[PDB]
Amino acid sequence: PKPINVRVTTMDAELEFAIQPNTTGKQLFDQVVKTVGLREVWFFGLQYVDSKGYSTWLKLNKKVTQQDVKKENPLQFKFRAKFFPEDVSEELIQEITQRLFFLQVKEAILNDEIYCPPETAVLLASYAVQAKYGDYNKEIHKPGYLANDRLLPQRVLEQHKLTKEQWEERIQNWHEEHRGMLREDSMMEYLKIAQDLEMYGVNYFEIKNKKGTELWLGVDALGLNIYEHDDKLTPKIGFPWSEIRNISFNDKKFVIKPIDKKAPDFVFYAPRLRINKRILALCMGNHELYMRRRKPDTIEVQQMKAQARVDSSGAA
């Protein structure tokens, strides 16, 4: 059989190679995972674009080429965080996990995919500079050191009237105060502030209700939420896992059956059947981890948290 060109990219890597034409998604995954030395695999997946212009997640069970993968050379893939923990502090154990979450989240905030207010964005920026350059040194980090760096969301630079050097001074002032903070600590402090942002870790889906009004369905670690089309920060209606008895779809109709037997089922419409299938898969994947983290840590996890306790110690 003729080999297929695949190119899985990490937030800070690029992995080009070939596999068997009749190879599963888990084989590609298990390969990417080992090449990179990632063990907390449960937060990740391989994202790809299809024939309709959608960015979904590779199914591990099926063959790579069978699930609608945009045909090209090489076959573009992206190793990314698919699930976000409820608390980054106690759930992202290893350094490689933390680094990958940091880069993806930072990339998303910078691209304006996740909203961030101006002051918070600057504070985030300084943690990013502290993480890249390390301790601020007046002698080496001479004025203009942050001129080649993209630090703020494009939309905060536009909504706020400050010159280029002024913004760089705001971030510099914060950088100075982070002295002593290691890279791992700096990225985690970044993620700690980022995880409280309204749009962080939310998977948005363009939907419509019975009437026809355009809405947004958001799927995250805690449940489902319906948003008004021009407001993706504040949910108009929320559905925590604890208030949902059942979730299902019928062609283009998705139904959320509440626990309260006196409340009406929430019904929405997706543009296509594939959307509803992906919506249910994500919900199940998030609820799965929601349950998993509420059950005692696996022997493997207990050991990783024990290994990180050592890699953070400064004693001989």
Partner: peptide, 16 residues
């Protein structure tokens, strides 16, 4: 031949 799907959120709690 079914273009449907369902998941029992409440029922999944095998915690018991």
């Amino acid at each position: 031949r079914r273009r449907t799907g369902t998941y029992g959120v409440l029922a999944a709690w095998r915690r018991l």
